Design a protein around this nucleic acid. Structure first.
Lengths: 71, 71
DNA sequence: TTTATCCGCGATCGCGGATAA
DNA sequence: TTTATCCGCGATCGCGGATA
């Protein structure tokens, strides 16, 4: 768990968490009630993703976030 | 620095950091080059706010984020 | 099976700009 | 001075759905 500085970095880290637990986009989507396509857009093109989508996906991954010093 | 679970909670936490440092929306917006209106929409209505905006505002605040376990 | 891409649709974004208050 | 709100604009969202 490290500091995250961009949407791309964020999406890559969460995608890795998804893969490391062997979850599919479809099963995560079903779990929180959004489209599989929405998870695919977030993983690939996270820049315009809504905060609401990010939080729903975070919950699906059994994750949360905290703020920290940029340093 | 607490676990954050929603856009509102995130926006409230970041607004608080802005105020605790005595920073105005205008000076943050000018610092990273976005609209003052954009920071205002984020603070009040964060749900559909983009990941790009959220990250720009974090940088303006000298903040970063980290993922963690949801518990 | 898994993931990425496309349609139309209604909604909202963030922009420049100008207010409102 | 500070922050919230509105306009028009082009872009993109996330939706149900159906492909690639």
């Amino acid at each position: 768990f490290q500091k995250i500085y961009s949407p791309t970095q964020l999406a890559n880290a969460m995608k890795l968490v998804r893969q490391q637990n062997g979850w599919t986009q479809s099963e995560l989507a079903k779990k929180i009630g959004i489209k599989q396509a929405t998870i695919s857009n977030f993983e690939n093109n996270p820049d315009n993703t809504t905060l609401t989508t990010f939080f729903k996906i975070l919950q699906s991954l059994e994750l949360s976030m905290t703020l920290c010093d940029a340093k």
